[PDB]
């Protein structure tokens, strides 16, 4: 039984937009949850967004968790943009609203609750795990069923 909840997560996509998909691996209690599933019309971006979402939404307490990722754009997020885009109210200098902005959001929430451990792994030098998210996220991109309801080629 592990003292922290691991999470590792990562997302595809075939086009911009395209169909995509995300997988991502969750230690919990004494489980290993695999949640995975592929979107018609989708970004690479939002994909990373929705794995992290996904998983940490499943936690019912407060817990300590540690997420590892590759995800550049989630790297960037976090430790770059976020606090900016909260100050401003989610806009942009040109006062439009941040793009993904509804999973920044719906992720800043999920984040809120718990104590926080990211670990920014090399997309060559992850563990088993990273490269099973991987996988996952390839194998939905290819088989969608869910519709990705936020996105926009817009705002």
Same mark, same amino acid.
């Given at each position: 039984?592990?003292?922290?909840? /691991? !999470? ?5 996509? $075939? ?11 969750? +230690? ?6 695999t ?5 018609? +019309?989708?970004?690479?971006? +939002?994909?990373? $967004?929705?794995? =992290? !979402? &996904?998983?940490? /939404? @499943?936690?019912?307490? %407060? ?14 997020? !976090?430790?770059?943009? !976020? %606090?900016n885009? *909260? *100050?401003?109210?989610?806009?942009? @200098?040109? *006062?439009k609203? &941040? *793009? #993904? &902005? ?6 800043? =929430? ?13 997309? %060559?030098?992850? %563990? ?8 996952? =996220?390839? =194998?939905?991109?290819? #088989?969608?069923?869910l ?7 817009? &705002?």
């Amino acid at each position: 039984m592990l003292k922290q909840v /691991e !999470i590792f997560t990562d997302g595809s996509c $075939l086009g911009n937009p395209g169909p995509g998909g995300y997988g991502a691996i969750l +230690r919990y209690r004494g489980r290993e949850k695999t949640f995975s599933a592929g979107y018609t +019309r989708t970004t690479n971006n +939002r994909m990373q $967004l929705m794995a =992290a !979402i &996904v998983a940490l /939404e @499943a936690l019912k307490e %407060h817990c300590e968790v540690i997420l590892s990722t590759d995800s550049q754009y989630v790297r960037q997020g !976090i430790t770059q943009w !976020i %606090h900016n885009w *909260k *100050k401003r109210g989610w806009k942009t @200098a040109d *006062k439009k609203p &941040v *793009k #993904n &902005v509804d999973l920044w959001q719906r992720l800043d =929430a999920a984040l809120g609750q718990h104590q926080i451990k990211w670990e920014w792994v090399k997309g %060559h030098a992850g %563990h088993p795990e990273n490269e099973r998210c991987d996988e996952l =996220a390839r =194998a939905a991109a290819m #088989n969608p069923t869910l519709e990705d309801t936020g996105y926009q080629v817009e &705002v």
